[PDB]
Amino acid sequence: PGEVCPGMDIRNNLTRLHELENCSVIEGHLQILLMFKTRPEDFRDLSFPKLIMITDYLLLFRVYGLESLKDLFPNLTVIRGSRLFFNYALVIFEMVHLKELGLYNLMNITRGSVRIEKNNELCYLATIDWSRILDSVEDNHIVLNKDDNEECGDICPNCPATVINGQFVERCWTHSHCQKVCPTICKSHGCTAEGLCCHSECLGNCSQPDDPTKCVACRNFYLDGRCVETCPPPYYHFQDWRCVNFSFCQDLHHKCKNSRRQGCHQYVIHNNKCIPECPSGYTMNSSNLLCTPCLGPCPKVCHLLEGEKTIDSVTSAQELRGCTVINGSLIINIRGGNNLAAELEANLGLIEEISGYLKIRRSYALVSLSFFRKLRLIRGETLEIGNYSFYALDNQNLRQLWDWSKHNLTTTQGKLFFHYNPKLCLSEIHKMEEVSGTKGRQERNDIALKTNGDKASCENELLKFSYIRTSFDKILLRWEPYWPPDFRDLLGFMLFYKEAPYQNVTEFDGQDACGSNSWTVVDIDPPLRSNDPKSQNHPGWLMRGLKPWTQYAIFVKTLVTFSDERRTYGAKSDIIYVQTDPKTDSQILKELEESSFRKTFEDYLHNVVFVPRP
């Protein structure tokens, strides 16, 4: 015949049909659609009389002036139907000037159903016996045609007939070609001109009977001008209609391992068939392209688009779903959305490794990078300019990088960058180079000393719990009183509690949103002070809404103001486990201004009423 050629997709012009000058079996799908400025005198000299077997489907969607199909595709015999369109293999929808269908030579559409709609000048639809053409007859859909009201005199020629539903009508495609039938002793191989049946392997027409070398549509597999039911070694099956050797399946894997845009389908060898990807629990060995099964968690493998991919929201993160090992750089820029509690841990909670450089540029909604829960290494083969591998700017609420007790990070090369991160403290970016080890291979990194620590504290003291008493439904919590050295500065206390299944809860985890929290924040006013070591000065708070036989987590967090030197104080108790038997940001600032206004006046009043002696 000819040579194989991939599938077209043509629209609005006619100049693209020249690429079928030599095609014979177009593997892929041919769909001709949306041609508006085409008069019927443009379709007279156009013919592809050697297109013989197409594999996926056919689609003719609003062409105008296509008078008949009997001069475009006059020698279609078999359509296969591996990939389908709405589970339909031949779609004729909304043409005009379409008088006769006229595909007078197709014999066995293998899988699917034909869908012919709403083409207001089409008859010769009633004389087409779809009982012996497609094997699964009950899903075709032929409504709203010209032949709802029978007006056109579809007389056809001398041609054989059968019965379908009680009516003994004749069978014909056009007014000059009738439907070829073969008697039932030789069911699917198809008959010759006088009524002998063909070889036991062929589909449709055969040129000479009982010779499998020269029929025109092999049913099972094509091999080198002969026809064969199972291709023996050293050959392999490919796209389940033709057979190639090992050399014809290897080289195109390397020839489109680089994408023009997409993709290629990178071919593997697995049990005598070149498949696009191995199934679950199987992975390719890169040496000879063999497919071998798994142990433990299998790589996916997730490569990425052009070296850098930016996450703006959840819809940007959907392409990285389930991705384990990433061969390039990565950048996160999250601002907001809705229901940000557990979704950022859901999309990338099984990530394993990242190999470029990581950018936390312009991210505001995050509180912590603990959602890289399984990440072990940033090795960084490619480097960011400035010899960097870790970059962070515009992090107004970031507070905690990683927990260096339950997790062990490492990295090898590059440098680091932490600038303009106020809430990120300084001792926690001193706590990472024991675990990461950049004091090894010792290098001068560039982190400024004053650019962090603002609206933050790290010299906190340790609060010890004093007395605990559990009832069936209530627990009291009194502890030891903490004072900053200027006791006007302490605004009050902040208590946090949540139920806990085991003894493994970490301190800042899972809330990770803008105005939401997994814990239950509760306030308590400070007590009074009487300059007395023993007095009624121990603070307290009563917790009421409990459940029987539960186990909770509780800790105490102070909240103080700032003297005008960027020198803060504070405290934080340990995480203690106990077992039984809207404050918006604008309200935080204005309530902290009024406490600094009452401190300022009675700081001025002492200053003029006491006068020292000279």
Binding site: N607, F610, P612
Partner: peptide, 21 residues
């Protein structure tokens, strides 16, 4: 200034005895 020599630092009882005649 009593609020700057007995609040920003410690002050001795020789110093704040000056305030009372």
């Amino acid at each position: 200034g009593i609020v700057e020599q007995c609040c920003t630092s410690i002050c001795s009882l020789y110093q704040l005895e000056n305030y009372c005649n």
